[PDB]
Amino acid sequence: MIKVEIKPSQAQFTTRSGVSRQGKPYSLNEQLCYVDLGNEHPVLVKITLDEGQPAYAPGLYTVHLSSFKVGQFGSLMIDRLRLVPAK
Amino acid sequence: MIKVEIKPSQAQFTTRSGVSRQGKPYSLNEQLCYVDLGNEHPVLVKITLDEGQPAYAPGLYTVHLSSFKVGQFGSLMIDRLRLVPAK
């Protein structure tokens, strides 16, 4: 399980000039999180916040492969890891 | 959990000219697997086989973030998903 802890100062997203894929500049809500990812310590990594979605509240987390996909290279590849609280 | 089923015809790796990262051609053992990844159906994806490691035997599987890492872009990123049997 790709655990992670959204610090208390990382419970709110912010609107920053985002870019889908070099097509157009989108102002989406971005957030942060701390994924140990097996690194023993928490790693403050960024995260996307759906429009209207509540920033990853303060709590434990576990990435979600719902964002992972199979590329034509025959190898899984995250397209936008969907973070979720750890149960 | 990134589930997956290593078909019965995908329980053995093969030695194919591999390339670490554009540095040198390595002949490692590669294998295959079927990760539904939430796609309802199984997706035959490729996989690497450590030298001396037994190809992903025939059984259920779940990728492993032990291969995932945090890039300097502030976003998790698989470096070489370590597949494992699903328990």
Counted domains in chain B: 1
Q: Which of B1, B2, B70 sits opposite A45 (nearest CB)?
A: B70
Residues of A in contact with B73 (CB under 8 A): 46
Distance in angstroms (rounded) separating the CA atoms of residues B70 and B83:
19
| Cα B45 from Cα B33, distance rounded (Å) | 5
A–B: how many Cβ contacts below 8 A? 66
Domain with B80, as residue range(s), is 1-87
- A10, A33 in Cβ contact below 8 A? yes
User: Residues with Cβ < 8 Å from B72, sequence gap 6 or more?
Assistant: none
Task: Report the amino acid identity of residue A56.
Answer: Y
Q: In what order do the strands lie in the sheet with B44-49?
A: B14-19, B25-34, B44-49
Three state DSSP letters for B22-76: CCCEEEEEEEEEECCCCCCCCCEEEEEECCCCCCCCCEEEECCHHHEEECCCCCE
What's the CATH number where B77 sits?
A: 2.40.50.140
Distance from CA of B86 to the nearest CA of A (A): 12
> What separation, in Å, do the N-terminal and C-terminal C-alpha atoms of chain A show?
10
What lies within 8 Å, CB to CB, of A66 at 6+ separation is: A82, B38
Method of elucidation: NMR
Beta bridge pairs of residue B16: B28
